[PDB]
Design an enzyme around this catalytic site. Structure first.
Site, PDB file in Angstrom:
ATOM      1  N   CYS B  33      38.689   5.401  40.539  1.00 58.44           N
ATOM      2  CA  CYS B  33      38.463   4.887  41.883  1.00 58.44           C
ATOM      3  C   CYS B  33      37.730   5.848  42.817  1.00 58.44           C
ATOM      4  O   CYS B  33      38.309   6.814  43.307  1.00 58.44           O
ATOM      5  CB  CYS B  33      39.800   4.478  42.488  1.00 58.44           C
ATOM      6  SG  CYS B  33      39.705   3.625  44.047  1.00 58.44           S
ATOM      7  N   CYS B  36      39.342   5.907  46.117  1.00 58.43           N
ATOM      8  CA  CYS B  36      40.636   6.562  45.957  1.00 58.43           C
ATOM      9  C   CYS B  36      40.475   8.054  46.193  1.00 58.43           C
ATOM     10  O   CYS B  36      41.228   8.664  46.955  1.00 58.43           O
ATOM     11  CB  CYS B  36      41.194   6.309  44.556  1.00 58.43           C
ATOM     12  SG  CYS B  36      41.514   4.576  44.198  1.00 58.43           S
TER      13      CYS B  36
END
Lengths: 105, 105
Positions: B33, B36
């Site tokens: 991600c 992320c």
């Protein structure tokens, strides 16, 4: 077993200072951690090795020590030689712990 | 970091059972991600707040926990007050996490 249980950061610091000439292996664990519990008996068995000191530490009780060695995942094993961190094994791998200790004997 | 990395569903369940009394923020991430990663630093900074607990979980390692909290996108932040899900924040907006934190503090 020869596992040393250390309950506070202050106690850990005293322990290190008394053992600056030893090879030390520290199992950082947490109470909620299943793999820590599964490997605990193998760590106990490892400690029959008198050529190193084997220590078990609860990350919730030794917050500063855990922070100092950058512990974030459980269990994490830290190898200390002549007072300084010389290795790190993340995860419940008895094989990886053996290899790391051997590297530093 | 005061940010814990929890790596199995049982560990998460056990962790929750030990902390029925606290407000917990869980960062559901994926190794891949991009967003992320972009927010991980801010999330670490946020955990300097000792009042609540801040945790990171890999959605791929904890499928059942992700399913349980209806996590279907990453990053997702799940706020858990006194052992129950109370809020969900989706996306890399730290401010929105703090807003959701200080909403049930």
């Amino acid at each position: 077993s020869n596992v040393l249980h250390i309950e506070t950061d202050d106690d850990f610091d005293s322990f290190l200072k008394e053992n600056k000439d030893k090879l030390i292996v520290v199992d950082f664990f947490a109470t909620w951690c299943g793999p820590c519990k599964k490997i605990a008996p193998a760590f106990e068995a490892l400690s029959a090795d008198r050529s190193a000191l084997y220590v078990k530490v609860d990350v919730d009780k030794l917050e500063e020590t855990a922070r100092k060695y950058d512990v974030s995942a459980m269990p994490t094993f830290i190898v200390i030689k002549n007072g300084e961190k010389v290795d790190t094994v993340v995860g419940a791998s008895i094989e990886n712990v053996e290899a790391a200790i051997r590297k530093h004997k």
